Amino acid sequence: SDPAAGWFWQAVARQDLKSVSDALDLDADAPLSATLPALSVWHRQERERVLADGWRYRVDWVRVAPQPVRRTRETWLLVVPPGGIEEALVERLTDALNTRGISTLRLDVPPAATSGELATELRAAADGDPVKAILSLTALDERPHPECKDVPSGIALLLNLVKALGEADLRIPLWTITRGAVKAGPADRLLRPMQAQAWGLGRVAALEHPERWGGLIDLPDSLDGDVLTRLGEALTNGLAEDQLAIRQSGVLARRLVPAPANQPAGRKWRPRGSALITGGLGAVGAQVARWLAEIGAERIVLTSRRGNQAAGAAELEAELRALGAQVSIVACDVTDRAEMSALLAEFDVTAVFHAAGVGRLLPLAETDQNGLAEICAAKVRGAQVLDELCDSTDLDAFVLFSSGAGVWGGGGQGAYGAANAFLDTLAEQRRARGLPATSISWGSWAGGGMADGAAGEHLRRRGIRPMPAASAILALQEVLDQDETCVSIADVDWDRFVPTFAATRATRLFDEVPAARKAM
């Protein structure tokens, strides 16, 4: 009933001054009169902290048992984007699909192909020979198109490819290959966040058009030995794994795993100097701001395109100043490198919180390259800009506000899932460079903001329970204290979530969440 009070009395017996005085934020010599107040606060907070512990999840990778060899010869269409890919790689893949039955039919995509044009190429290849599946390589094409700077050209291509299979009425599994979009074990250092976008989108493609969608596979850095053979068997798995990574140690499948925090944490995180929240005048940024003020940030810099013009801006400066912090509210687009650069240097910021972003529910079929740009630009490109600046092990915190939409997905959330899966890989890439980064993909928050709409209705109806802001904050604190990289923090009603989520499409994604097992 009360594990907090449990642990307290278990510390009281045991006589752990160290644990208790840490817990209460007090010195061994503190008077009872300071001790009592600190107790009631710890008590309210510990009970919410224990609640929030059960909201944590991480992404693991589990070994998938080899089960080949098998089958007779099929034709696959191999789709190759205009950039990002070495001929030597196409040949090695082609040659390894051949040595396992799969005959290859190569389609080369022109730059900025439309869904109309691709459906034509698909219609032609479909009639020619008997195509069983499509192996798309287009996600390796990271460069933006110059017309549309904020979208990687291969992700524009994936999109138009999912739509083109529709326009063509083509009912044929699409498989999406990436190299470095996931971290599947310690030792992965090829991390390519623009390619993670394929995974964020792909999970949604899988829900919206299960019939069009084979799966996602991540190739390793080193393609020596047998990895390319394992590719061939991965494409045929018949275990219905649809999120795979191929490594030195074989084929690995993506799982979501409860990640309860094993105590204690190795620090109590506090901002030193200035803290920056981009999108700091939104619902979530306002909370993050109140928290920083409460825990003694000397200055909070809040940015947004509207800046001081933003509804609530003057309320919020008042509240923050009433808690003793200095406040700077600036109008600044995240995507503007010079303005952000001047900004960081002027205030000497020591902690960055990236909350700039837009939410919109929009089916993949209704999404185009501009919509994708509209949704991604501040989140993704604001994250690169921040990453480029901040070339610095000194920073206390480089915290990205991501979403469950980017970790497991949901209908309507192609572009948003893409933008969010980028951040999780960006955070991993940064760590691999020796920099700090933290990416937290939230379930919805109570209060205003992105989960407040009829949108909040949709998400409640899918079995995501909004988290009280104060408990969300407590969980952020915890992540920061724990010095974590990626962790997902959501209050999910598994009874209701799973049946909705797995209506159209089976998934092994949640096999390791007990409450999710129960729910069919």
CA distance 351 to 271: 7
Whether 307 has a binding-site annotation, put simply, is no
Cβ proximity to a copy of itself: between 48 and 424 the closer is 48
Q: Which is nearer to ligand NDP, 194 or 489 (CB)?
A: 489
Q: From CA 281, how far away is CA 292, in angstroms rounded?
A: 14
> By CB under 8 A, is residue 132 in contact with a copy of itself?
no
Asked if residue 445 belongs to a known ligand binding site, the reply is yes
- Judged by CB under 8 A, does residue 25 bind a copy of itself? no
Query: Cβ–Cβ contacts within 10 Å for residue 2, how many?
Result: 12
Q: Is 407 annotated as a binding residue?
A: no
User: For a copy of itself, which stretch binds (CB under 8 A), given 24-32, 346-354, 394-402, 477-485?
Assistant: 24-32
Query: For residues 92-129, b (16+ Cβ closer than 10 Å) or e, as one string?
Result: ebbebbeebebeebeeebeebbbbeebbebbeebbeee
Q: Is the Cβ of residue 9 or residue 273 nearer to a copy of itself in the bound state?
A: 9
Contact partners, residue 220, CB within 8 Å, separation at least 6: 179, 188, 190, 227, 245, 246, 247, 248
Terminal Cα-to-Cα distance of the chain (whole angstroms): 28
Q: Helices marked H in 377-413 — which ranges?
A: 382-388
Taking the C-alpha atoms of residue 512 and residue 385, their distance in angstroms, rounded to an integer, is 36
Q: Give residues in contact with ligand NDP (CB under 6 A).
A: 278-279, 281-285, 303-306, 310, 333-335, 355-359, 378-379, 382, 401, 403, 442, 444-445, 449-451
Using rule CB under 8 A, residue 17 touches a copy of itself: yes
Instruction: Pick between residue 255 and residue 381 the one whose CB is nearest to ligand NDP.
Output: 381
Cβ–Cβ < 8 Å for 389, 404: no
CB-based contacts of 389, cutoff 8 Å, min separation 6: 337, 340, 341, 344
Residue among 1 and 393 whose Cβ is closer to a copy of itself? 1
Q: Which of 3, 25, 44, 128 binds a copy of itself (CB under 8 A)?
A: 44
Flag whether 508 is marked binding.
no
Q: For 377-516, list the strands marked E by DSSP.
A: 397-403, 438-442, 464-465, 486-489, 491-492
Q: Which does 27 bind (CB under 5 to 8 A by kind): a copy of itself, ligand NDP, none?
A: a copy of itself
Residue 172 neighbours by CB under 8 Å, 6+ apart: 77, 126, 131, 132, 133, 134, 165, 212
Q: Which of 28, 65, 311, 338 binds a copy of itself (CB under 8 A)?
A: 28
35 contacts a copy of itself (rule: CB under 8 A): yes
Please, are residues 59 and 255 in contact by the beta-carbon 8 Å criterion?
yes
Q: Which residues pair with 492 in a beta bridge?
A: 464
Q: Which CB, 50 or 455, lies closer to a copy of itself? A: 50
3-state class (DSSP) for residue 55: coil
> Between residues 26 and 451, which has the closer beta carbon with respect to a copy of itself?
26
- The interface partner of residue 304, options being a copy of itself, ligand NDP, none and the CB cut-off 5 to 8 Å by kind, is ligand NDP
50 is in an annotated binding site: no
Point out the residue whose Cβ comes nearest to ligand NDP: 282
Residue 366 burial (10 A CB sphere; 0-12, 13-18, 19+): exposed
Pairwise CA distance, residues 259 & 487, whole Å: 8
Q: Output the smallest distance, CB 386 to ligand NDP, in A.
A: 11
Q: Which partner in a copy of itself, ligand NDP, none is near 132 (CB below 5 to 8 A by kind)?
A: none
Backbone angles phi, psi at 145, to 5 degrees: -80, 140
Residue 467 annotated as lining a ligand binding site:
no
CB of 308 to ligand NDP, least distance (A): 10
Q: How far is the CB of 178 from a copy of itself (least distance, A)?
A: 49
Q: How far apart are CA 284 and CA 358, in angstroms?
A: 12
Tell me if 15 contacts a copy of itself by CB under 8 A: yes
Q: Does 3 bind a copy of itself (CB under 8 A)?
A: no
Please choose, out of 16-24, 62-70, 225-233, 298-306, the segment that lies near a copy of itself by the rule CB under 8 A. 16-24
Q: Residue 122 or residue 155: which is nearer to ligand NDP going by CB?
A: 155
Shortest gap between Cβ of 380 and ligand NDP (angstroms)?
10
For residue 21, state whether it binds a copy of itself (rule: CB under 8 A): yes
- Separation between Cα atoms, residue 222 and residue 455, nearest integer Å: 43
CB 297 within 8 A of CB 95: no
Q: Which residue ranges are tagged as binding site for NADPH?
A: 283-284, 304-306, 333-334, 355, 357, 379, 416, 445, 450
Q: Which residue ranges are tagged as binding site?
A: 283-284, 304-306, 333-334, 355, 357, 379, 416, 445, 450
The residues binding a copy of itself (CB under 8 A) are 5, 9, 12-17, 20-21, 24, 26-33, 35-37, 39-40, 43-44
